[PDB]
């Protein structure tokens, strides 16, 4: 009761994959959709499935749900992180070079502008 069965959890994880888009934030509308897409013998086990679906879907939107990949949610999240910084690390003109590392740059005859500590 207080701990869900592995048959319940496995059958709940599949419905997130194929039917992600018809989910919502509220619990009571998830009771309707499982009557369309799932064939369940009993009534009491059915309410545990739809209550577990809002647990996973809400923990997708803000939390860290491991071992579950949905293509739709991850794409727009990377678009928030595809912004570019205005200033990179490569804007600095002065490089800090050690007196040991100075001799390599002179041996290979490189054209960088090196300044020590």
């Amino acid at each position: 009761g207080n701990i869900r069965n592995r048959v319940i959890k496995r059958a709940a994880r599949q419905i997130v994959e194929k039917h992600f888009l018809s989910l919502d934030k509220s619990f009571d509308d998830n009771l309707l959709v499982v009557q369309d897409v799932a064939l369940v013998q009993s009534k009491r086990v059915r309410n545990q499935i739809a209550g577990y679906v809002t647990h996973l879907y809400k923990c997708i939107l803000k939390g860290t749900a491991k071992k579950l990949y949905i293509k739709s949610h991850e794409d727009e999240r990377e678009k928030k992180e595809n912004i570019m910084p205005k200033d990179s690390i490569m804007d600095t003109e002065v490089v800090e070079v050690d007196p040991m590392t100075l001799e390599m740059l002179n041996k290979n005859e490189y054209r960088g502008n090196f300044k020590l500590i």
């Binding site: 570019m84 600095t92 040991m100 290979n108 960088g112």
Partner: protein, 197 residues
């Protein structure tokens, strides 16, 4: 032969030439000297460019680049390999490497690659361990203190700092683009921000 231009500013910033306190017996010629106060070895940036040419030479002339796998276990390493994989059409494998993906045929995602690439050899042992069972070529970025079993090309870098690991993927992304399509390398230096956080 191609010439490295203004990539010395990338490695000297990102501390890619920094090493460990002690060196292994097989690393050898890649050390130019040590610091006096902190006793930290240095890596010659000349010969590391030689391995960058050679690793690209083995990666090219594959008829289909989808038959090339990259592995990574470091938490920072996920962002950098996914930027590298899309430009080179390679299949990336992130996280804990499941034992049996090359040999056992009952795993969920079976895969039959030809060329294997490894970020850190000590951190990813099972991929090199399963590369001894089926005949594969391996590329690895190794520090001064690592074992070199079951690896034929070594690119010596610094693999502790997460900022440095995205650089070696960044230089590798240009050369395969350069060897396949005749283009000027180092088009936009500002594209390193998509690799780092």
């Amino acid at each position: 032969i191609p010439i490295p231009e203004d990539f010395v500013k990338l490695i000297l910033i990102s501390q890619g030439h920094l090493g460990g306190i002690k060196t292994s017996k097989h690393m050898g010629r890649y050390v130019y000297g040590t610091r006096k106060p902190e006793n930290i070895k240095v890596i010659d940036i000349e010969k590391t460019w030689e391995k960058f040419i050679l690793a690209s030479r083995m990666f090219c002339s594959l008829q289909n680049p989808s038959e090339a796998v990259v592995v990574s276990t470091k938490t920072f390493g996920r962002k950098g390999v996914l930027k590298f994989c899309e430009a080179t059409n390679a299949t990336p494998v992130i996280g804990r490497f499941i034992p049996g993906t090359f040999c056992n045929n009952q795993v969920k995602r079976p895969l039959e690659p030809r060329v294997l690439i490894v970020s850190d050899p000590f951190a990813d042992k099972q991929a090199l361990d399963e590369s001894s069972y089926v005949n594969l070529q391996t590329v690895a970025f190794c520090n001064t203190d690592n074992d070199v079993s079951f690896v034929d090309v070594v690119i010596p870098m610094n693999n502790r700092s997460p900022v440095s690991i995205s650089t070696g993927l960044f230089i590798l992304s240009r050369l395969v683009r350069f060897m396949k399509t005749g283009e000027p390398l180092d088009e936009n230096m500002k594209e390193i921000e998509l690799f780092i956080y």
